[PDB]
Amino acid sequence: NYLDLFSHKNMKLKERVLIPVKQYPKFNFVGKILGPQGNTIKRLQEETGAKISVLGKGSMRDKAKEEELRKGGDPKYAHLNMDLHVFIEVFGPPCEAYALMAHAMCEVKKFLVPDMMD
Amino acid sequence: NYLDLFSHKNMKLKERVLIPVKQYPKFNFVGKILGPQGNTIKRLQEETGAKISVLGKGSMRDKAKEEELRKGGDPKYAHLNMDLHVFIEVFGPPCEAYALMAHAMCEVKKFLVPDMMD
Protein backbone atom coordinates (compact mmCIF):
# COMPACT_ATOMS: atom_id res chain seq x y z
CA ASN A 1 0.00 0.00 0.00
CA TYR A 2 2.86 2.57 0.60
CA LEU A 3 5.17 3.63 -2.30
CA ASP A 4 8.91 3.17 -1.70
CA LEU A 5 10.92 5.32 -4.12
CA PHE A 6 13.87 2.94 -3.66
CA SER A 7 11.87 -0.26 -4.27
CA HIS A 8 13.42 -2.55 -6.88
CA LYS A 9 9.93 -3.18 -8.32
CA ASN A 10 8.33 -0.82 -10.87
CA MET A 11 4.77 0.30 -10.31
CA LYS A 12 2.05 -0.36 -12.89
CA LEU A 13 -0.72 2.08 -13.81
CA LYS A 14 -3.63 0.83 -15.90
CA GLU A 15 -6.84 2.60 -16.97
CA ARG A 16 -9.78 1.66 -19.17
CA VAL A 17 -11.21 4.80 -20.80
CA LEU A 18 -14.58 4.36 -22.45
CA ILE A 19 -14.80 5.57 -26.02
CA PRO A 20 -17.80 7.97 -25.77
CA VAL A 21 -19.96 6.40 -28.49
CA LYS A 22 -22.94 7.51 -26.42
CA GLN A 23 -22.03 11.19 -26.82
CA TYR A 24 -20.75 10.98 -30.39
CA PRO A 25 -22.90 8.27 -32.05
CA LYS A 26 -21.61 8.90 -35.56
CA PHE A 27 -17.88 9.61 -35.07
CA ASN A 28 -15.44 6.88 -36.16
CA PHE A 29 -13.19 6.80 -33.11
CA VAL A 30 -11.64 3.43 -33.79
CA GLY A 31 -10.39 4.53 -37.23
CA LYS A 32 -9.08 7.88 -36.05
CA ILE A 33 -7.15 6.26 -33.15
CA LEU A 34 -5.76 3.29 -35.03
CA GLY A 35 -4.86 5.28 -38.12
CA PRO A 36 -3.99 3.86 -41.58
CA GLN A 37 -2.68 0.33 -40.80
CA GLY A 38 -2.17 1.33 -37.17
CA ASN A 39 0.26 4.22 -37.66
CA THR A 40 -1.53 6.61 -35.34
CA ILE A 41 -1.71 4.20 -32.45
CA LYS A 42 1.91 3.16 -33.13
CA ARG A 43 3.03 6.83 -33.12
CA LEU A 44 0.84 7.59 -30.13
CA GLN A 45 2.48 4.87 -28.04
CA GLU A 46 5.94 5.93 -29.20
CA GLU A 47 5.26 9.62 -28.37
CA THR A 48 3.73 8.89 -24.91
CA GLY A 49 5.70 5.83 -23.73
CA ALA A 50 2.58 3.87 -22.82
CA LYS A 51 0.96 0.71 -24.12
CA ILE A 52 -2.31 1.76 -25.69
CA SER A 53 -4.94 -0.65 -27.06
CA VAL A 54 -8.41 -0.34 -28.45
CA LEU A 55 -10.62 -3.07 -26.96
CA GLY A 56 -14.26 -4.06 -26.74
CA LYS A 57 -17.23 -4.42 -29.06
CA GLY A 58 -16.36 -2.66 -32.32
CA SER A 59 -12.60 -2.47 -31.75
CA MET A 60 -11.86 -4.40 -34.94
CA ARG A 61 -14.60 -2.78 -37.13
CA ASP A 62 -15.59 -6.02 -38.80
CA LYS A 63 -18.80 -7.20 -37.11
CA ALA A 64 -18.18 -10.61 -38.79
CA LYS A 65 -14.56 -11.29 -37.66
CA GLU A 66 -15.41 -10.12 -34.11
CA GLU A 67 -18.39 -12.51 -33.98
CA GLU A 68 -16.21 -15.42 -35.07
CA LEU A 69 -13.36 -14.81 -32.61
CA ARG A 70 -15.70 -14.39 -29.63
CA LYS A 71 -17.67 -17.54 -30.57
CA GLY A 72 -14.34 -19.42 -30.64
CA GLY A 73 -14.20 -19.20 -26.86
CA ASP A 74 -10.50 -18.30 -26.89
CA PRO A 75 -9.71 -16.04 -23.86
CA LYS A 76 -7.34 -13.64 -25.65
CA TYR A 77 -10.48 -12.39 -27.38
CA ALA A 78 -12.60 -12.12 -24.20
CA HIS A 79 -12.56 -8.32 -24.31
CA LEU A 80 -14.68 -8.20 -27.49
CA ASN A 81 -17.69 -8.35 -25.15
CA MET A 82 -16.91 -5.26 -23.13
CA ASP A 83 -17.93 -1.70 -23.89
CA LEU A 84 -15.63 -0.11 -26.43
CA HIS A 85 -12.69 1.44 -24.62
CA VAL A 86 -9.01 2.45 -24.73
CA PHE A 87 -6.71 0.61 -22.37
CA ILE A 88 -3.63 2.49 -21.19
CA GLU A 89 -0.87 0.55 -19.42
CA VAL A 90 2.36 2.10 -18.05
CA PHE A 91 5.10 0.85 -15.76
CA GLY A 92 8.01 2.56 -14.07
CA PRO A 93 9.03 4.13 -10.75
CA PRO A 94 6.25 6.46 -9.39
CA CYS A 95 7.42 9.70 -10.91
CA GLU A 96 7.97 8.19 -14.37
CA ALA A 97 4.80 6.08 -14.28
CA TYR A 98 2.46 8.94 -13.37
CA ALA A 99 4.19 11.17 -15.91
CA LEU A 100 3.66 8.61 -18.66
CA MET A 101 0.08 7.92 -17.61
CA ALA A 102 -0.62 11.64 -17.66
CA HIS A 103 0.95 12.06 -21.09
CA ALA A 104 -1.11 9.18 -22.51
CA MET A 105 -4.33 10.05 -20.71
CA CYS A 106 -4.23 13.56 -22.13
CA GLU A 107 -3.31 12.59 -25.69
CA VAL A 108 -6.08 10.03 -25.55
CA LYS A 109 -8.56 12.70 -24.37
CA LYS A 110 -7.83 14.71 -27.51
CA PHE A 111 -9.06 11.68 -29.45
CA LEU A 112 -12.10 10.89 -27.34
CA VAL A 113 -13.31 14.46 -26.94
CA PRO A 114 -12.93 15.47 -30.59
CA ASP A 115 -14.77 18.78 -30.45
CA MET A 116 -12.94 20.07 -27.39
CA MET A 117 -12.03 23.73 -27.76
CA ASP A 118 -8.44 23.13 -29.17
CA ASN B 1 -13.93 0.27 -12.78
CA TYR B 2 -14.06 1.99 -16.27
CA LEU B 3 -13.30 5.75 -16.61
CA ASP B 4 -15.99 7.85 -18.31
CA LEU B 5 -14.54 11.15 -19.55
CA PHE B 6 -18.05 12.64 -19.42
CA SER B 7 -18.84 11.47 -15.87
CA HIS B 8 -20.08 14.25 -13.59
CA LYS B 9 -17.87 12.85 -10.78
CA ASN B 10 -14.18 13.78 -10.45
CA MET B 11 -11.66 11.02 -9.91
CA LYS B 12 -9.39 10.98 -6.85
CA LEU B 13 -5.74 9.94 -6.87
CA LYS B 14 -3.99 9.36 -3.55
CA GLU B 15 -0.47 8.08 -2.81
CA ARG B 16 1.56 7.58 0.36
CA VAL B 17 5.27 8.02 -0.42
CA LEU B 18 7.63 6.87 2.30
CA ILE B 19 10.23 9.40 3.36
CA PRO B 20 13.44 7.35 2.87
CA VAL B 21 14.84 7.72 6.40
CA LYS B 22 16.33 4.26 5.91
CA GLN B 23 18.53 5.45 3.02
CA TYR B 24 19.31 8.91 4.42
CA PRO B 25 19.42 8.42 8.22
CA LYS B 26 20.74 11.90 8.98
CA PHE B 27 18.90 14.15 6.49
CA ASN B 28 16.16 16.40 7.90
CA PHE B 29 13.43 15.73 5.36
CA VAL B 30 10.55 17.02 7.43
CA GLY B 31 12.19 20.46 7.83
CA LYS B 32 13.20 20.76 4.18
CA ILE B 33 9.67 19.86 2.99
CA LEU B 34 7.72 21.94 5.46
CA GLY B 35 9.99 24.95 5.19
CA PRO B 36 10.13 27.94 7.60
CA GLN B 37 6.61 28.01 9.15
CA GLY B 38 5.33 25.80 6.32
CA ASN B 39 6.17 28.04 3.36
CA THR B 40 7.75 25.32 1.27
CA ILE B 41 4.87 22.92 1.62
CA LYS B 42 2.43 25.81 1.04
CA ARG B 43 4.31 26.85 -2.13
CA LEU B 44 4.68 23.24 -3.20
CA GLN B 45 0.93 22.65 -3.07
CA GLU B 46 0.24 25.94 -4.83
CA GLU B 47 2.77 25.16 -7.62
CA THR B 48 1.54 21.54 -8.16
CA GLY B 49 -2.21 21.81 -7.45
CA ALA B 50 -2.22 18.86 -5.06
CA LYS B 51 -2.87 18.45 -1.37
CA ILE B 52 0.42 17.42 0.19
CA SER B 53 0.89 16.43 3.85
CA VAL B 54 3.69 15.08 5.93
CA LEU B 55 2.38 12.28 8.16
CA GLY B 56 3.65 9.54 10.45
CA LYS B 57 6.16 9.17 13.27
CA GLY B 58 8.37 12.26 13.26
CA SER B 59 6.12 14.43 11.10
CA MET B 60 5.84 17.11 13.80
CA ARG B 61 9.51 16.94 15.01
CA ASP B 62 8.62 17.22 18.67
CA LYS B 63 8.84 13.70 20.14
CA ALA B 64 6.93 15.08 23.18
CA LYS B 65 3.90 16.69 21.42
CA GLU B 66 3.54 13.63 19.15
CA GLU B 67 3.53 11.31 22.19
CA GLU B 68 0.81 13.37 23.85
CA LEU B 69 -1.51 13.58 20.83
CA ARG B 70 -1.28 9.86 20.08
CA LYS B 71 -1.90 8.95 23.74
CA GLY B 72 -5.03 11.14 23.61
CA GLY B 73 -6.70 8.51 21.45
CA ASP B 74 -8.16 11.14 19.10
CA PRO B 75 -8.45 9.66 15.55
CA LYS B 76 -7.32 12.76 13.64
CA TYR B 77 -3.89 11.96 15.07
CA ALA B 78 -3.98 8.22 14.22
CA HIS B 79 -1.35 8.63 11.50
CA LEU B 80 1.40 9.49 14.03
CA ASN B 81 1.92 5.72 14.32
CA MET B 82 2.66 5.02 10.69
CA ASP B 83 6.02 5.15 8.97
CA LEU B 84 6.99 8.69 8.06
CA HIS B 85 5.56 9.51 4.65
CA VAL B 86 4.23 12.19 2.29
CA PHE B 87 0.58 11.92 1.35
CA ILE B 88 -0.41 13.31 -2.04
CA GLU B 89 -4.11 13.78 -2.82
CA VAL B 90 -5.50 15.12 -6.13
CA PHE B 91 -8.96 15.24 -7.66
CA GLY B 92 -10.21 16.14 -11.11
CA PRO B 93 -11.23 14.56 -14.42
CA PRO B 94 -8.70 11.84 -15.52
CA CYS B 95 -6.44 14.00 -17.63
CA GLU B 96 -6.19 16.77 -15.01
CA ALA B 97 -5.89 14.37 -12.07
CA TYR B 98 -3.03 12.33 -13.53
CA ALA B 99 -1.31 15.52 -14.64
CA LEU B 100 -1.50 16.96 -11.13
CA MET B 101 -0.43 13.69 -9.52
CA ALA B 102 2.54 13.52 -11.87
CA HIS B 103 3.52 17.12 -11.13
CA ALA B 104 3.36 16.52 -7.37
CA MET B 105 4.95 13.07 -7.43
CA CYS B 106 7.95 14.44 -9.30
CA GLU B 107 8.41 17.58 -7.20
CA VAL B 108 8.15 15.37 -4.14
CA LYS B 109 10.84 13.03 -5.53
CA LYS B 110 13.25 15.96 -5.71
CA PHE B 111 12.76 16.29 -1.96
CA LEU B 112 12.96 12.61 -1.07
CA VAL B 113 15.90 11.77 -3.30
CA PRO B 114 18.07 14.75 -2.33
CA ASP B 115 21.30 13.65 -3.95
CA MET B 116 19.74 12.78 -7.30
CA MET B 117 21.91 13.95 -10.18
CA ASP B 118 20.13 17.38 -10.68
SS3 sequence of chain A:
CCECCCCCCCEEEEEEEECCCCCCCCCCHHHHHHCHHHHHHHHHHHHHCCEEEEECCCCCCCHHHHHHHHHCCCHHHHHHHCCCEEEEEEEECHHHHHHHHHHHHHHHHHHHCCCCCC
Q: How far apart are alpha carbons B19 and B56 in whole angstroms?
A: 10
Q: Which residues pair with A88 in a beta bridge?
A: A15, A52
Q: By C-alpha distance, which of A34, A57, A44, A30 is closest to A105?
A: A44
Rg (chain A; Cα; Å): 16
Q: How far is B73 from chain A (nearest CA, A)?
A: 24
Please tell me what resolution, in angstroms, this structure has.
2.8
Cα torsion A109, A114, A117, A118: sign: positive
As a whole number of angstroms, the distance between CA B17 and CA B106 comes to 11
Helix (H) or strand (E) holding B94: helix B94-112
The nearest CA of chain A is from the CA of B3 a distance in Å of 5
Q: Which residues of A touch B (CB under 8 A)?
A: 1-6, 15-18, 20, 22-23, 83, 85, 94-95, 98-99, 101-102, 105-106, 109, 112-113
In terms of CA atoms, which chain B residue is nearest residue A84? B2
- Considering only CA atoms, which of A95, A78, A66 is closest in space to residue A87? A78
Alpha carbons A42 and A108: distance in angstroms, whole number: 13
* Amino acid at the residue B79: H
Q: Which is it for strands B11-18 and A51-55: parallel, antiparallel or unpaired?
A: unpaired
The answer to whether the Cα torsion of B101, B106, B109, B111 is positive or negative is negative
CB atoms within 10 A of CB B87: 18
Instruction: Count the alpha carbons within 13 Å of A30 in the hemisphere toward its beta carbon.
Output: 14
Residues 6+ apart with CB under 8 A from A89: A12, A13, A14, A50, A51, A52, A53
Q: Give the Cα separation of A110 and A51 in Å (integer).
A: 17
Cβ A108 vs Cβ A68: under 8 Å = no
Looking at chain A, how many residues does it have? Answer: 118
Alpha-carbon Rg for chain B, nearest whole angstrom, is 16
Could you give the strand order of the β-sheet that contains A85-92, starting from the edge strand earlier in sequence? Answer: A11-18, A85-92, A51-55
Measure the CA–CA gap between A113 and A110, rounded to whole angstroms.
6
* A107 neighbors B98 (Cβ within 8 angstroms): no
CATH numbers and ranges of domains, chain B: 11-112 (3.30.1370.10)
CB A5 within 8 A of CB B21: no
Q: Cα separation of B7 and B94, whole Å?
A: 10
Please state, in angstroms and as integers, the Cα–Cα distance from residue A31 to each residue in A36, A48, B105, following that order.
8, 19, 35
Residue A15: is it exposed, middle or buried by C-beta count within 10 angstroms (0-12/13-18/19+)?
buried
CA-to-CA separations, A19 to A49, B43, B75, B106, B112, in angstroms, rounded? 21, 37, 42, 30, 38
Residues A85, A55 contacting (CB under 8 angstroms):
yes
Find, in chain B, the residue whose alpha carbon is nearest to that of A4.
B18
Residue in A with minimal Cα distance to B13: A98
